[PDB]
Amino acid sequence: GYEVHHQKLVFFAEDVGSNKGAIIGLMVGGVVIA
Amino acid sequence: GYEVHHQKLVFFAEDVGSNKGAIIGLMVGGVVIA
Amino acid sequence: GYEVHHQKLVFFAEDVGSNKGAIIGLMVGGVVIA
Amino acid sequence: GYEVHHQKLVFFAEDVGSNKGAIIGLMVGGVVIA
Amino acid sequence: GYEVHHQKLVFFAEDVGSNKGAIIGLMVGGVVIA
Amino acid sequence: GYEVHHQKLVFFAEDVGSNKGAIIGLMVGGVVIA
Amino acid sequence: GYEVHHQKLVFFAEDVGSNKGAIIGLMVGGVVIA
Amino acid sequence: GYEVHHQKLVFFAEDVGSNKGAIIGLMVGGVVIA
Amino acid sequence: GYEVHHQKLVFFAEDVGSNKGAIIGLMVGGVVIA
Amino acid sequence: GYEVHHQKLVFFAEDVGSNKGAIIGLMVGGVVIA
Amino acid sequence: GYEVHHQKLVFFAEDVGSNKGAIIGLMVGGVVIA
Amino acid sequence: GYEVHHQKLVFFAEDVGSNKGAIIGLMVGGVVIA
Numbered sequence: 500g501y502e503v504h505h506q507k508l509v510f511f512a513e514d515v516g517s518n519k520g521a522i523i524g525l526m527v528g529g530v531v532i533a
Numbered sequence: 534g535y536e537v538h539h540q541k542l543v544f545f546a547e548d549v550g551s552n553k554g555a556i557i558g559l560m561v562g563g564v565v566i567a
Numbered sequence: 568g569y570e571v572h573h574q575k576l577v578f579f580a581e582d583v584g585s586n587k588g589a590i591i592g593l594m595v596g597g598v599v600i601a
Numbered sequence: 602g603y604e605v606h607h608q609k610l611v612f613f614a615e616d617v618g619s620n621k622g623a624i625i626g627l628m629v630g631g632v633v634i635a
Numbered sequence: 636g637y638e639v640h641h642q643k644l645v646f647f648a649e650d651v652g653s654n655k656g657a658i659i660g661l662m663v664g665g666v667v668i669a
Numbered sequence: 670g671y672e673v674h675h676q677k678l679v680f681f682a683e684d685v686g687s688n689k690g691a692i693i694g695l696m697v698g699g700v701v702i703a
Numbered sequence: 704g705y706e707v708h709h710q711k712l713v714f715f716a717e718d719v720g721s722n723k724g725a726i727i728g729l730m731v732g733g734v735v736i737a
Numbered sequence: 738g739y740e741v742h743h744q745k746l747v748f749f750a751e752d753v754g755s756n757k758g759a760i761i762g763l764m765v766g767g768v769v770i771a
Numbered sequence: 772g773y774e775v776h777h778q779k780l781v782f783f784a785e786d787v788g789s790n791k792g793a794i795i796g797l798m799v800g801g802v803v804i805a
Numbered sequence: 806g807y808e809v810h811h812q813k814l815v816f817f818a819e820d821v822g823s824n825k826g827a828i829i830g831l832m833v834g835g836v837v838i839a
Numbered sequence: 840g841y842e843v844h845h846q847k848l849v850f851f852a853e854d855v856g857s858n859k860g861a862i863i864g865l866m867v868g869g870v871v872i873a
Numbered sequence: 874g875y876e877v878h879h880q881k882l883v884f885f886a887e888d889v890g891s892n893k894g895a896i897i898g899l900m901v902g903g904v905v906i907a
């Protein structure tokens with residue numbers, strides 16, 4: 500009697516342009532110097 | 534008698550332009566120096 | 568009585584253009600100097 | 602009574618153009634100097 | 636009573652053009668100087 | 670009662686053109702100077 | 704004039720014994736059927 | 738004037754014994770059936 | 772004026788004994804049936 | 806003015822004994838049946 | 840003004856004894872039946 | 874102004890004894906039946 504479907508997970512749906520910095524979807528630990 | 538569907542999770546729906554800093558969707562620990 | 572289907576996980580759905588920095592979908596540890 | 606199907610995982614769905622930096626789908630450890 | 640099928644994992648679905656930097660699908664350790 | 674089939678793993682589905690940098694599907698250790 | 708040190712992040716400090724279920728330190732997306 | 742040191746991140750500090758289930762430090766996507 | 776050192780990341784510091792299940796430090800996608 | 810050193814990443818610091826299951830340090834995609 | 844040194848990455852620091860299952864440091868794709 | 878040295882990557886630092894299963898440092902694709 501269990502049913503799971505059509506989940507959805509997005510990080511950056513739209514466009515990413517002319518980036519000159521640091522774009523990170525998921526970070527664990529770690530250092531960022533933008 | 535259980536049913537789950539059509540969930541949805543977004544972090545940045547729209548556009549990301551000319552970034553010069555640090556954009557992070559999910560961070561655990563870690564240091565950021567923008 | 569268990570059934571899972573049609574999950575979906577995206578990091579960058581749209582386009583990525585003229586990047587001059589650091590774009591990272593998932594990072595564990597590690598240092599980034601943008 | 603178990604069944605899993607039609608999962609899907611993407612890192613960069615759309616196009617990647619004129620890149621002059623560092624684009625990384627998944628990083629463990631390691632240093633990036635963009 | 637177990638069955639798994641039709642999984643799918645992609646790193647760069649769309650096109651990659653005129654790259655002049657470092658594009659890496661999965662990195663463990665290692666240094667990148669873009 | 671176990672059955673697995675029709676998995677699929679891709680690194681660069683679409684085309685790769687006019688590359689002048691370093692495109693790497695999977696890297697363990699190692700240094701990249703793009 | 705900036706200095707950060709001696710941070711610390713733990714998920715399971717003590718012991719984990721005779722587990723018969725699902726113990727997960729950090730989960731993003733994904734389904735768990737315990 | 739920037740200095741970061743002596744960070745530390747642990748997932749399971751203590752012992753793990755007689756496990757009969759699923760112990761996962763970090764999971765992105767994916768299904769677990771314990 | 773930047774300096775980073777003595778970071779540290781561990782997944783299972785202590786011992787792992789008599790395991791009869793699935794112990795995974797980091798998982799992306801993928802199914803686990805313990 | 807940049808300097809990084811003495812990072813460290815471990816997956817299983819301590820001992821691993823009498824294993825009868827599946828111990829995996831890092832998994833991308835793929836199915837595990839313990 | 841860039842310098843990186845003395846990084847270190849380990850998968851199984853301590854001993855591995857009397858294994859009767861599947862111990863894998865890094866897996867991409869692929870099925871494991873322990 | 875770039876210099877990298879004294880990196881280090883290990884898979885099994887300590888001893889491996891009386892193994893009766895499958896120990897694999899790095900696997901891409903492929904099936905394991907322990």
Ligand SMILES: CNc1ccc(CCc2ccc(OCCOCCOCCF)nc2)cc1
Pocket residue numbers: 528529530561562563564596597598629630631632663664665666698699710711712744745746778779780812813814846847848880881882
């Ligand atoms: C607030 N809590 C917190 C906790 C932890 C952190 C950072 C942890 C970390 C761990 C490792 C790392 O780098 C690994 C370098 O591995 C390159 C090996 O390269 C091999 C070439 F052959 N960086 C950072 C930050 C904050």
Ligand SMILES: CNc1ccc(CCc2ccc(OCCOCCOCCF)nc2)cc1
Pocket residue numbers: 506507508540541542574575576608609610642643644676677678732733734766767768799800801802833834835836868869
């Ligand atoms: C409430 N929002 C929400 C959002 C998302 C989710 C789940 C997302 C997800 C994505 C992928 C996945 O599985 C990937 C299977 O990849 C195996 C490929 O194996 C290759 C063998 F060769 N599972 C779950 C749940 C909830």
